[PDB]
């Protein structure tokens, strides 16, 4: 007996095209998405070239339209030079991404004044998301209040961060957040097994107490999002390992295992992988789109999942219960039992759909 | 023709007693204060032992009462263990100091939740000051808003920081700040002369653009305070130089030079070294207390000032115009032309004066 889910949405993926296509490209990354029960992804802008201007966005749009197998929206990235220049293309993007700490990213800003300039100039009705760790969460929340708008915090990983967000929500502040599966299912306890290179990720893996705090504060978590951050094994195991884990193919199986164990409900999962992503990012429905999962199937995560070019996974050896059996995307069979059945280019930019534009008031 | 000033107040000094008395002690540091035209100082808690509990405060009070030559108040320091424990002694302190970044300090906190706990537990009517650099300024402002109270930002040193505070004030937020003389009168341009050890200070010396921004935004600066941070030349020039500059003896001459050049007015100076310190920290008046200065005397800062045990100065070689000629403290001549004339122990804890208690509403 399969369970039918709606088309799940991952609002934080790195698909590496343009410029990093040995790690992943639109075709491989969206195959990984479909195999993970994900029918829509929002791709981050830290590519090469980074998506920080209109010409780079135009290129990325075409590469995505040609390569994507599932539907998508593309983020713009904030830079030290582009505040006040993105107005004509802003509405065509998923939102604006701010990189406020050291990580795999033309995009760390050097001053909080630059953050303020982005919050002041980016259209007020469009999403802003931030990589903001530890005190940076409080800092960016202050900037959002000064500029009287909302902000979404990416990959929350620590007790400190979730409790700060909880306190902000208790004061009625417009903040939402997401959590990635590695911060729910891995911790410091796993670093011995992973080793120092594979274990590199930002935010770093947390203590058992961090992980426990995220679970205890599930009510504070608006979305799950993979932060699918593919790098090859050679890169992860080499002399300057880049941070990040692949995660599209493992996210849903990990979370279904948790549902089966009663750690959260099916509804809790679907709020966080479907309804809240839609409402925070104003992402449109996908007609005749659904995912069929088998909740009874027990399996062990192998040393690499079939689709991501990363060709490794930090979840190797974990026992999971739950598998994606079939995905239908806009009336076509997209995935069955390990086979992707839609070609590169089947996917579409949801921001071009009439229903995918973010509503806004008319010029004065 | 001498100009009579009121008794000036320095709300940020490190007097090193207990535990660092080769660098300074209450007697030498307050001699330095008097020679700099300062009749009241607020001493920071990063001593050895640090002033983070009632017994340490009791010790420091007695050492100060016995050694101080000018009047004083003593800060308590926030630690990772003392939130909720300082209520009985809080009103006897200058205020609570939070160390939120790496510097010469049992006192960096590890989580913003610890900051929140201090803001929630410290009595709401008493001062809180923070060492908070760059984005940390925005973060601590967020914590202050979440807990609906004020905060004072120590030694603002950067364009980024003063502009953030300016934006907060424009939104009516209860934030005040101070600036130290080295951030007004030294910059990166001076690092070649100072060298890497002597030049170590937190916040670090800024660019010419940082310095220019502080001057341009003088209206945003509530107080001047030295951050007198004495260390010996051996320590500054050794293999692990501690950050900090001595500054009590040079602050007023530097600022008087600026007044003489029309960079700020005498009133601007007195707001920042007298009236605003009084009102932010609820420091009492000092009866029959004044400072006589000679505004015409030109001199060059020597390699060390006479009183601080630091026995060096980063302002060596700067030409100044303005000198402290006489200080009268509570009806006694305390300083004349290079001679301190009040003994260790003349100074008093202003928080013990009836007029030095911070006003508060009665228990419910
Ligand atoms: N999270 C990571 O460790 N890496 C991400 C970047 C990011 O989300 O910050 C990547 O693009 O590789
Ligand atoms: N400012 C410094 O560089 N050092 C100060 C500490 C401080 O004010 O942070 C000290 O106590 O030495
Ligand atoms: Zn990130
Ligand atoms: Zn994100
Ligand atoms: Zn990311
Ligand atoms: Zn909507
Ligand atoms: Zn400091
Ligand atoms: Zn201070
Ligand atoms: Zn200090
Ligand atoms: Zn008062």
UniProtKB/Swiss-Prot annotation, chains A, B:
Consequence of substituting residue 53 to N: No change in catalytic activity
Result after altering residue 155 to A: Abolishes dihydroorotase activity
Result after altering residue 103 to A: Abolishes dihydroorotase activity
Native source organism of the sequence: Homo sapiens (Human)
Effect of residue 12 to N: Abolishes dihydroorotase activity
Encoding gene (name): CAD
Region (DHOase (dihydroorotase)): 1-329
Residues the record lists as binding Zn(2+) 1: 12, 14, 97, 227
Induction details: Transcriptionally repressed following hypoxia by HIF1A.
Role, per record: Multifunctional protein that encodes the first 3 enzymatic activities of the de novo pyrimidine pathway: carbamoylphosphate synthetase (CPSase; EC 6.3.5.5), aspartate transcarbamylase (ATCase; EC 2.1.3.2) and dihydroorotase (DHOase; EC 3.5.2.3). The CPSase-function is accomplished in 2 steps, by a glutamine-dependent amidotransferase activity (GATase) that binds and cleaves glutamine to produce ammonia, followed by an ammonium-dependent carbamoyl phosphate synthetase, which reacts with the ammonia, hydrogencarbonate and ATP to form carbamoyl phosphate.
Lineage of origin: Eukaryota, Metazoa, Chordata, Craniata, Vertebrata
Positions that bind (S)-dihydroorotate: 16, 46, 202, 231, 243
Range of the intact protein held here: 1460 to 1823 of 2225
Lineage: superkingdom: Eukaryota
Entry similarity comment: In the N-terminal section; belongs to the CarA family. In the 2nd section; belongs to the CarB family.
Known outcome of mutating residue 131 to N: No catalytic activity
Name of this chain's protein: Multifunctional protein CAD
Residues annotated to bind Zn(2+) 3: 97, 131, 155
Result after altering residue 12 to A: No zinc-binding and no catalytic activity
Note: GATase (glutamine amidotransferase) and CPSase (carbamoyl phosphate synthase) form together the glutamine-dependent CPSase (GD-CPSase) (EC 6.3.5.5).
Post-translational modification: Activated by MAP kinase (Erk1/2) phosphorylation just prior to the S phase of the cell cycle, when the demand for pyrimidine nucleotides is greatest, and down-regulated as the cells emerge from S phase by protein kinase A (PKA) phosphorylation.
